[PDB]
Amino acid sequence: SFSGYLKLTDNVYIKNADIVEEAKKVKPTVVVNAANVYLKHGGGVAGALNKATNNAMQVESDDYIATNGPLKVGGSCVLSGHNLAKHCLHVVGPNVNKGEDIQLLKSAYENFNQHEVLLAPLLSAGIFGADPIHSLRVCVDTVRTNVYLAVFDKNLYDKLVSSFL
Ligand SMILES: c1cnc2ncccc2c1
């Protein structure tokens, strides 16, 4: 199971780890992807998860978009987890760098409540442009299910833990 996670709250845990490597090791029921509305997994967590699936995640995502159209910012869809997890929950947090509404971050985290346990990144953090300290705060105040956060950056991980209220 999940190991080496620091407990933040009753249900939120955090570790300095590459979510791809965490996924290959744990093979959780659900890995969360930091998706965009088009499921175009180019960079950040999405690009890394997709590259780990040998592009099978992108092929599956393009078929999903061809059938269903784009997701909403704050929305999600459940697709295969391929070699990483049983399922991948593609969650669209607002991309501040693309001018999207930061108020949608709480709606994005509400998607996690449909799954008992998840391996996840901090939504809207990294190349999405939001303040990761704010994202962790919204996570612990929104998610009620068991969330194991993987923070790739060591220096950001230290900053998140040492500043956690
Ligand atoms: C490999 C490469 N880029 C990453 N970016 C964000 C999170 C995890 C990653 C792993």
Strands (E), 44-136: 76-80, 87-92, 117-120
Between the CA of residue 159 and those of 11, 117, 137, 156, 163, what are the distances in Å?
A: 20, 25, 13, 5, 6
Nearest Cα neighbor of 118 from 21, 14, 6 is 14
Ligand 1: centre distance to CA 48 (Å):
5
Structure determined by: X-ray
DSSP string, 109-132: HHGGGGSSEEEEPPTT-GGG-S-H
**Which residues, in sequence order, are CB contacts of 159 under 8 Å at separation 6+?**
132, 133
**12: region left, alpha or beta (phi > 0 left; psi from -120 to 50 alpha):** beta
Ligand 1: centre distance to CA 114 (Å):
25
For ligand 1, pick from 16, 135, 152, 156 the residue to mutate: most ligand atoms within 8 Å of CB. 152
What resolution does the deposited structure have, in angstroms?
1.1
**Which residues, in sequence order, are CB contacts of 135 under 8 Å at separation 6+?**
93, 105, 122, 123, 124, 125
**164: region left, alpha or beta (phi > 0 left; psi from -120 to 50 alpha):** beta
Whether residue 71 contacts residue 77, with contact meaning beta carbons closer than 8 Å, is answered with yes
Please, what is the Cα angle at 78 between 16 and 124, to 5 degrees? 45
The protein residue whose alpha carbon is closest to atom 7 in ligand 1 is 45
Quote the CA–CA distance of 62 and 85 in Å, as a whole number.
19
For ligand 1, residues with CB inside 6 Å are 18-20, 44-45, 48, 126, 152
